[PDB]
Amino acid sequence: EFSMKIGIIGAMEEEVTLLRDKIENRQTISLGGCEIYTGQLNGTEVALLKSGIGKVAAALGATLLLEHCKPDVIINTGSAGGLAPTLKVGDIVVSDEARYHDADVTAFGYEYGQLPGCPAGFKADDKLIAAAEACIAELNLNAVRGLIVSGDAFINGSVGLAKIRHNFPQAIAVEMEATAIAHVCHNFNVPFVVVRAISNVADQQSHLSFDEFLAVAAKQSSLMVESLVQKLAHG
Amino acid sequence: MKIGIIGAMEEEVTLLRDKIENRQTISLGGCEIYTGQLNGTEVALLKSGIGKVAAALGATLLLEHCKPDVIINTGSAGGLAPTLKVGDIVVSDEARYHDADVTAFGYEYGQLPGCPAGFKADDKLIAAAEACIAELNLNAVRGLIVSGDAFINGSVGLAKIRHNFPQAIAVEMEATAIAHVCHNFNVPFVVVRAISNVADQQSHLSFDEFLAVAAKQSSLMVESLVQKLAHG
Ligand SMILES: CSC[C@H]1O[C@@H](n2cnc3c(N)ncnc32)[C@H](O)[C@@H]1O
Numbered sequence: 001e002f003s004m005k006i007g008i009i010g011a012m013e014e015e016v017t018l019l020r021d022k023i024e025n026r027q028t029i030s031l032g033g034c035e036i037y038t039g040q041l042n043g044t045e046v047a048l049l050k051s052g053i054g055k056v057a058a059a060l061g062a063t064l065l066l067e068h069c070k071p072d073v074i075i076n077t078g079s080a081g082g083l084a085p086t087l088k089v090g091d092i093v094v095s096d097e098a099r100y101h102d103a104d105v106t107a108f109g110y111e112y113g114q115l116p117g118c119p120a121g122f123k124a125d126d127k128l129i130a131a132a133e134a135c136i137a138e139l140n141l142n143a144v145r146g147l148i149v150s151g152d153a154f155i156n157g158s159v160g161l162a163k164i165r166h167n168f169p170q171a172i173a174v175e176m177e178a179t180a181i182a183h184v185c186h187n188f189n190v191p192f193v194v195v196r197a198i199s200n201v202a203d204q205q206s207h208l209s210f211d212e213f214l215a216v217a218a219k220q221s222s223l224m225v226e227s228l229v230q231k232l233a234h235g
Numbered sequence: 236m237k238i239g240i241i242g243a244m245e246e247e248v249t250l251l252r253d254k255i256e257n258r259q260t261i262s263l264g265g266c267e268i269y270t271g272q273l274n275g276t277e278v279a280l281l282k283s284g285i286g287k288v289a290a291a292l293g294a295t296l297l298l299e300h301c302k303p304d305v306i307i308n309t310g311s312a313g314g315l316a317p318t319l320k321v322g323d324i325v326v327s328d329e330a331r332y333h334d335a336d337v338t339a340f341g342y343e344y345g346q347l348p349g350c351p352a353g354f355k356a357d358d359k360l361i362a363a364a365e366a367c368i369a370e371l372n373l374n375a376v377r378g379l380i381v382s383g384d385a386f387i388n389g390s391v392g393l394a395k396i397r398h399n400f401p402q403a404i405a406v407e408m409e410a411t412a413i414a415h416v417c418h419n420f421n422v423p424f425v426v427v428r429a430i431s432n433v434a435d436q437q438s439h440l441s442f443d444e445f446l447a448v449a450a451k452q453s454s455l456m457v458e459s460l461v462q463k464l465a466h467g
């Protein structure tokens with residue numbers, strides 16, 4: 001397809017810089033505190049947004065990206081804290097869906113993590129997921145697919161981590177933007193998929209590990225997005 | 236001037252929607268915005284839905300599609316200040332996320348990277364609110380309002396908020412996301428909400444009993460505030 005535009009969202013400069021550097025005929029849109037780089041990745045039109053950290057920042061950015069750029073699909077990239085036992089720093093996690101691990105209106109009968117007016121979780125697009133898995137296989141990378149949960153806190157072991165494992169025993173990774181992006185996408189009916197890499201395991205060593213392994217995570221997730229954009233656009 | 240107003244629930248915005256004349260409706264991103272005049276003042280009323288993301292998406296659409304000069308966030312809230320009773324008013328001096336924590340990276344508790352630790356509400360909007368409160372003989376408290384994506388009802392939830400923000404006068408779920416979006420677009424804002432519960436273990440029961448009263452009181456304050464801002 002020669003008419004599609006793939007949207008990509010990363011929260012930090014370290015997470016979008018590799019991709020930004022590969023954009024052909026790049027230009028930059030500066031709006032509401034966010035930056036969006038337009039151009040093409042090996043011929044495929046893309047709109048890469050640096051959203052900032054956290055749920056609100058990502059929502060605000062995701063909304064602007066959809067409104068000003070109208071991408072057909074959205075891919076959220078960057079690093080995450082690994083929760084699945086087989087995950088090691090560098091490994092890829094693909095979202096089957098996204099849920100807020102810090103949303104709680106259970107007092108009114110909603111299931112934990114669900115906000116009023118929203119489904120309890122947001123489902124990633126089946127085709128995007130299948131495409132991401134193909135890339136994972138073609139690149140011979142270790143990955144895990146499943147539930148990714150977001151919140152506005154950096155998980156670093158202790159109660160923060162345990163509470164999450166307890167409410168979401170099946171969660172494979174934790175971060176701070178995916179569910180806000182999926183929430184916005186859901187409201188606009190835009191297909192999305194989260195493809196991040198592991199930089200820590202959200203335990204008490206998470207900050208030490210994050211600082212040490214963010215670059216390798218950025219590299220691996222960036223490689224995956226580059227490969228995914230190509231696959232989604234031409235097969 | 237065009238005054239932006241944001242409420243989360245139908246119950247919080249319905250009284251106001253009923254008063255908007257030359258009324259039109261914008262439906263987008265799962266949100267509804269009612270435009271027109273309120274007692275002779277141009278307004279844009281957004282029903283955002285509950286939570287930070289819904290409020291952030293809503294506020295972003297409102298600014299971009301309606302470009303109001305200022306924003307007023309209304310609705311009910313859980314009172315934390317000792318002198319608040321159900322129905323009373325809380326006015327924001329400032330808004331802070333009570334559930335944001337990146338302190339592992341040196342940011343202040345509640346502060347997200349790239350943002351000020353707190354979002355200061357507009358002095359003139361605050362002054363005007365305080366004027367209406369005095370003119371209406373209402374009981375109110377002004378100060379820090381904290382937002383999170385959890386309904387607070389005693390226990391650990393309430394204890395953690397008391398620990399990090401002992402000066403918080405109220406707690407709710409949209410104010411700071413709205414302040415955060417307004418910050419990014421240089422738009423003045425203020426929070427004027429009415430109490431429906433005191434965020435203790437009986438907060439769900441109080442909420443259900445008093446949301447109607449809180450919606451009414453908050454709606455009246457907004458109506459008076461809008462009129463004062465546009466006509467003295
Ligand atoms: C510096 S704040 C952490 C940033 O990296 C992601 N992240 C990586 N590991 C973690 C973790 N263990 N807890 C929370 N967010 C994480 C988040 O989405 C946010 O953009």
Ligand SMILES: CSC[C@H]1O[C@@H](n2cnc3c(N)ncnc32)[C@H](O)[C@@H]1O
Nearest residue numbers: 243311312313386387407408409434
């Ligand atoms: C049904 S979820 C509660 C809704 O009312 C407000 N609210 C009122 N009291 C409280 C409370 N005690 N804790 C959290 N949000 C509250 C929130 O902003 C949200 O829109």
